[PDB]
Specification:
5 copies of one chain form a homopentamer. Chain A is an alpha+beta fold. Chain A folds into 2 domains: 212 residues, no CATH class; 147 residues, no CATH class. Chain A is 37% helix and 25% strand. Chain A is built from 5 helices and 17 strands. In chain A, strand 15 and strand 16 form a beta hairpin. In chain A, helix 4 packs antiparallel against helix 5. The first copy, chain A, is rod-shaped. Chains D and E meet through helix 1, strand 1, strand 6, strand 8 and strand 9 of D and strand 4, strand 5, strand 9, helix 3 and helix 4 of E. The complex binds 2-acetamido-2-deoxy-beta-D-glucopyranose (5 copies). The site of one 2-acetamido-2-deoxy-beta-D-glucopyranose (NAG) has 3 residues of chain C, from loops. It is classed as membrane protein. Keywords: Ions Ligands Receptors, Glycine receptor Recombinant Proteins, membrane protein. It forms a pentameric assembly. Full length alpha1 Glycine receptor in presence of 1mM Glycine. Chains A, B, C, D, E: Glycine receptor subunit alphaZ1.
Amino acid sequence: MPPSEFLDKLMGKVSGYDARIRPNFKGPPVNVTCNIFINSFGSIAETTMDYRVNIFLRQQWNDPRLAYSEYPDDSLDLDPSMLDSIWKPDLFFANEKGANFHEVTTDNKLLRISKNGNVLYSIRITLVLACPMDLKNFPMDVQTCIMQLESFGYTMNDLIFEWDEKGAVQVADGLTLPQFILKEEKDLRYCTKHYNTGKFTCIEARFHLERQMGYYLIQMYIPSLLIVILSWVSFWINMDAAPARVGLGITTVLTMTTQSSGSRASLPKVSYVKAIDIWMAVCLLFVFSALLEYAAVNFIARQHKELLRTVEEMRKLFISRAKRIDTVSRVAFPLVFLIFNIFYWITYKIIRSEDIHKQ
Amino acid sequence: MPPSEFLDKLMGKVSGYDARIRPNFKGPPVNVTCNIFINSFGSIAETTMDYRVNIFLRQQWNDPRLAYSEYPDDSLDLDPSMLDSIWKPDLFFANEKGANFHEVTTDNKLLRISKNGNVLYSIRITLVLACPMDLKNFPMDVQTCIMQLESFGYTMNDLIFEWDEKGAVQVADGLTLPQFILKEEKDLRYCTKHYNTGKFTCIEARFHLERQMGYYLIQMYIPSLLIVILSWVSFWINMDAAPARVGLGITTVLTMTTQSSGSRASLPKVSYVKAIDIWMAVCLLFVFSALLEYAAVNFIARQHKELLRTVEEMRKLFISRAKRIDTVSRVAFPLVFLIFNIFYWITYKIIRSEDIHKQ
Amino acid sequence: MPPSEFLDKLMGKVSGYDARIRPNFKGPPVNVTCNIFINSFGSIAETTMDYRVNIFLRQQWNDPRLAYSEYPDDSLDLDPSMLDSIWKPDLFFANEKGANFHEVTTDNKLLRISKNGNVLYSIRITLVLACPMDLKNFPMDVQTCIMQLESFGYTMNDLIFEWDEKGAVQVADGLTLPQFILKEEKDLRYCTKHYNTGKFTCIEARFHLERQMGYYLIQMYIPSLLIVILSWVSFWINMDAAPARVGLGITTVLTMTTQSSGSRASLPKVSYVKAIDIWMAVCLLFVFSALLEYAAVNFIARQHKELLRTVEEMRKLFISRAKRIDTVSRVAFPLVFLIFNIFYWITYKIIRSEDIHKQ
Amino acid sequence: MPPSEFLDKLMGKVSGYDARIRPNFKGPPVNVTCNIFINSFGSIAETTMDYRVNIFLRQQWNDPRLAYSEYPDDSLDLDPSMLDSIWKPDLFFANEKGANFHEVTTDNKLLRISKNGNVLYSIRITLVLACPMDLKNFPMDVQTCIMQLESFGYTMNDLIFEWDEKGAVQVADGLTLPQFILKEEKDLRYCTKHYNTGKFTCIEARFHLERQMGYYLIQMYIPSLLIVILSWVSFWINMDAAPARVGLGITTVLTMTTQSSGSRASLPKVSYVKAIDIWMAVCLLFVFSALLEYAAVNFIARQHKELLRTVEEMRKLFISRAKRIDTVSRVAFPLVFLIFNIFYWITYKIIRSEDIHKQ
Amino acid sequence: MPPSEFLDKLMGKVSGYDARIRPNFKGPPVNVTCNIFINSFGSIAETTMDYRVNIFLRQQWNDPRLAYSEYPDDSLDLDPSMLDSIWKPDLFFANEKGANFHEVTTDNKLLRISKNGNVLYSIRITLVLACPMDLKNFPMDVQTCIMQLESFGYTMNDLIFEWDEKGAVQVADGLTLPQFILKEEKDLRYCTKHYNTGKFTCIEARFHLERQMGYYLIQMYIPSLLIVILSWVSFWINMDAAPARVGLGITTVLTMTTQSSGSRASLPKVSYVKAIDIWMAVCLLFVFSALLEYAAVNFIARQHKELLRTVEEMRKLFISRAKRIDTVSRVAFPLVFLIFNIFYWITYKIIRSEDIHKQ
Ligand SMILES: *[C@@H]1O[C@H](CO)[C@@H](O)[C@H](O)[C@H]1NC(C)=O
Ligand SMILES: *[C@@H]1O[C@H](CO)[C@@H](O)[C@H](O)[C@H]1NC(C)=O
Ligand SMILES: *[C@@H]1O[C@H](CO)[C@@H](O)[C@H](O)[C@H]1NC(C)=O
Ligand SMILES: *[C@@H]1O[C@H](CO)[C@@H](O)[C@H](O)[C@H]1NC(C)=O
Ligand SMILES: *[C@@H]1O[C@H](CO)[C@@H](O)[C@H](O)[C@H]1NC(C)=O
């Protein structure tokens, strides 16, 4: 019983199998269970709001036809070069750019057929998928990125898509992302589509990504803090009269503006204010207030110069103010900073915890 | 009544359907109604003057042929692999670069045919479209971007394009742009094309985009203002004789030139002057005038040095000028700035309001 | 008289039309008139010396065959899917990179055939074309960019290319370039090609582009001038003894070097010296000479310090020199700058005027 | 005995050779030996974690069919245009992006067939392969990059992949990399794949790459060291009272922050701390501690100013501290730096030596 | 004698011409002479070590078949659409990335056939070719870039490649490169390839490129020199006691480090030290030594301060040293620089002259 004779006999010009007609025509819709395996996730672009994923799509549906029932083995592994002579369902991705196939030495495709007629179609695909991420809290956030699968040409009374009950979404073992930590929530929902042409089936899968704060802390939170420390200690424990104290402030402001521009470099332009903007704005406000304080001290010194020639009675009165302000500044500034840091870190921790619970 | 027999019978070698001849040949022009659905707008490049759009083109026309009239159901959903055996009309985009199709698991295409002969052709297309935007007012403006559809090979007495009376342009729900706000004007006009070869049909669609000022305000209007504030308060409330006061001005000018270069970084080179250029030029003029004022004060001080050895009569005469100028400067500069800001913001608000009314 | 029968009958297996043999074989060369319409010019890259153009090529030639002479209408608009069964001439572009076609909903192609046999072939093409621009005068210049069309496979006694007598080159109405102004010279020449294999026909078209000076003036000529003004007025109207005067020069030099590097940023590396290099070099020379002058003043002051303890006789002798140099510098520097600006702007104006007359 | 007759006769419609059925069907799995030749390795991207390689894949397997046994010469070199009429095995790369073929003048392919039936299939391929490199030790490290080959459609009882016993991996003579030194370990392992669909064969090859420290040393280790040297010697051998000493520190800090940002520029964002970060952090700590020391000296000087009007008894007591600290600083700082450098270089040398031994 | 009948008759199903069998089968190897014309060289990337070239490949070989010998004209220009029905030889480029063809309006291809059977095959190709350039001497060097042509599928007793005796390599008239000057050496060698599969023919062509020093001199050699001049003259002709003199050095060092980083920006990372690195290192050493000298002068001044209250006997002794060092520095530094420049320019001139003679 040669393989070739049977092979053609099933889907040949002698067989009545038309590949342009859906199975069970004029009948109940063809149910399709979809299984996805993630081979290599990664390369998430924050600029143009998209990520790259290489999946192994797997879809099964039941055909009354192609149930040979005359062979010792129930499952037959067929050629992937005769995949044009069967009824593949139409499937497209809604948030999709590009999405090439792969042709290395052979087409990366798979066909299997059981005795009853259940088929197994497996396709390797790299997808560039659009994720409209919300950057309300930039360094610490959970981002949800969407994969949607729809039928382009078939209305709801044909080709209903369903998920797989067990192991709908899998991940390759030892798969890591440099920037994000993937979570195991693996949310799945059915989100039907309505158009003027008709109503079309859809199923979607949701992934939760948390952002590591390790890079961001080292890159920005540490340098900005160190420059605040530098300004604080450096000028106040210097003599009242000096060009250096003044110059220090200007240079510190220059560093702050360069770092502020540097932070908002990779990020796409957005209307709302991110957390990192709040932090850098507060640090800039601290150094600006510090330079203003020194300018005020200089004015008090100017008053002393005018007084110098009941002369000494006024002199000390102003000078003592000079000293009092200088000491209060020394003890006042760090405590206020400490207070800011605590009420900032606490609230952000509460927001991120609430966000993960909400999602 | 098997599907295959009829299916071929309509558009087969036994049928007299030639796909190279227009329907109703030697007759009135084939009218075509066009419906467009916008799946995902975005990614607008200001440099090379273009934007990206992913649409769902839909065009309907009437064929006397293909009106079977022998089936229980009026509408038949046919295969998208037999779309080469019918009379699709020619259609191209005038301001177009690229414009690939999509081939993911199947071609993303749709064919429908009613009992009378009205067809429905639906195509998924990503377009890179050229928009010749006018940057007269850079941060606040309304930009109109053009989509034009034309018949390449058919003159006006064939294949007249028309718009759809109801729901000509739709937008996918919850579609947002990071940089712009789309408006609901959805202007539609017919803009016929004349060539030496002949006169060709065209229809166009206009989109109005407003620019959010949230990013621009934070990125440039706030830092420049803060550096003006810094210069103003810092030097004048310092003693007349100091190297610091001089140095401050030079560094402030350095910041202004770097920010001015930074502003005109993404923008393409254009002859006309943008609003942001006016703002940065005025701020640069303020700090330049401030440094000139300090230089003049130094010259008055030089006069005092020459006088120092009717000697004291001249001395005070110049010194009082020194004081008078210093105080007037303190009160003079902010009010003039305030006046500038009001007459700048008011006029730009009037221009943008006029522009939206005009469009 | 059905369309299909005739349609095939002309260029069918029953017709003796071989599409691999040139018309009028063993005869006079096939003359071809070429008409070009420019749909969208632009995107000129100065780095890799090329520009992008989207044209509508149109070529006409006479075929003795395909002159049916039996139809009421002289001109027939045929399908663009049967363009493989005729004798298209070979045509390629010599300074060409890439040059894709366009396939949106249909091929963008056109076929027309008259009663005598004159055909009309219209093709939409985007060309990346190499322009070896000469940057001798960078901000103000006229650049000539070349389009060449040649026959790859046919020697001069076949397929002679000719231009069209009227309307050889057209431009779409309201077509503008952000950087350049297109001129209406529209030069056309025939520039035959000689090879060892044979002698091949060619025709070329020349476009003249002038550069707007509006962006360049604002970006570089104004900031550099303002920094020269700043240095000039700032240090000389300050007291002889100061750290500030010295520091000012160094910072001004830093600005000059950064701007000089910034100017030569987009530009490709070239051996010859551009006009902008001359301007920035002269401005750098002015500030360098200014700092040297201050250093000399300091040395004269050093002489006074040595003299201070016929002592006063020497003292004033040197001091008066100090004053004399300071005043002459004040009046000397701007006039010399003014002279430089006039003899620079005048000569460049003469060169550009001569260049346009020459071209 | 004409070539054509035999040529077709072997794999023709008269032959029973079906190219869709595996050789030795219903039998032991088809064993495949794989030989790889590396034509041009290189272009390793640290950002998106991948490298480029151009290989010569070679795979041999035994076919009972195609053993003609009637020719004088055992080995026949066949055409590479009839490679569609045989049973090529499926093969794909797991960590693969892209992987085009090459079509220059002909397809770059090879077919050979021996008398017994052993075939030789040779394919030229450029692979972009994903390497998840570990940057724990950035300048000095050994990186292992993975190539994996798998059967997409065939389970373990078909198409078992095996390596070649002799010369499995070769390298073209005189092949060098600008950044890395390739090692000759050439590790080979079999790393079978398990899926829910089935169990699939795989074989992998490991390459060891060491990083040259020549560029990194010159680019970063030398400038940072020179700036530490500059700060150290420059300020301490200057008078106690000066604006210059203060300013020096701020500028040195500015250089350190710019260099620190410059170092972490090419590198992708990662949570863990690299060796270069440790080095730059320690150098920044040294200059920060130096500026703090100067600030403390200024405070001691302030005490002297307060004392100046048992007055002189206190004065010297503080002044001597000033001198003592200044001298100890002079001798203290370099030795501590020397100690740091030795314990840093030694430990990194031990870690890299351990790593190469482990791998 | 119609063209079509003969045309097919030569290479038709009635002719015994099999296009899968080499001419003169079981015979001496098919000799192939190769002629290359360079249409447009250029776009040489120093980063990823490659260049772009657009060539006109021409190869001739002798076929016993296709020698009609019955026509008045010896040479026939055939269609380039029947190039699939002949025996083209296999040819690939070893150092090749990409290498597309060109399809503009027609395939850019040529076929000619003489009476004896000598064919002429002409192909237009753009090649991206890998050149492993040696950057030992960066601004002045001669670089040799390699083109290699090999037979992928045929061993040495078939398809031997040979060069053309006259005019093997040509260049289009008036072809210029912005960065390099092409030389006329046009070296040609045969460099056979050995593999385990077999021994394969190869022929190679060598191009010599010299680098213009005009851009590099202006961009780096002039600014660095000017900044050395600035430092030299500026500080030494200033009073011994000043904050300005100190600050000058730090700023000059900042310029040197920025320029040094700027130089090594386009260049790929390499272990060895380039000439430009030597030059910038020496200039940095000069300014570093200058600042150290000023620091030493300050220490001598400190000694004078300690002495000031046999007191005056010590005072002058140190002061005279101060003066002596200051003058020697003034005359010492430029001569040493002059010596460096001469022994640097001379040796590099000798090395480049030796290199061109060697090549
Ligand atoms: C597909 O699913 C629908 C709804 O679950 C059901 O009504 C229909 O019978 C199913 N089709 C089958 C089992 O063929
Ligand atoms: C198409 O529209 C034109 C103008 O509206 C009309 O004259 C013509 O009859 C229409 N064709 C039809 C209805 O087939
Ligand atoms: C084509 O032009 C040439 C030169 O103008 C002429 O000799 C020849 O007769 C022309 N061919 C025609 C008119 O068919
Ligand atoms: C292939 O290898 C397996 C295991 O080494 C062996 O059992 C089998 O017989 C081999 N197949 C052959 C030699 O055809
Ligand atoms: C090709 O060249 C080889 C060596 O030069 C020679 O032996 C052989 O006869 C040549 N083949 C011909 C002339 O057909």
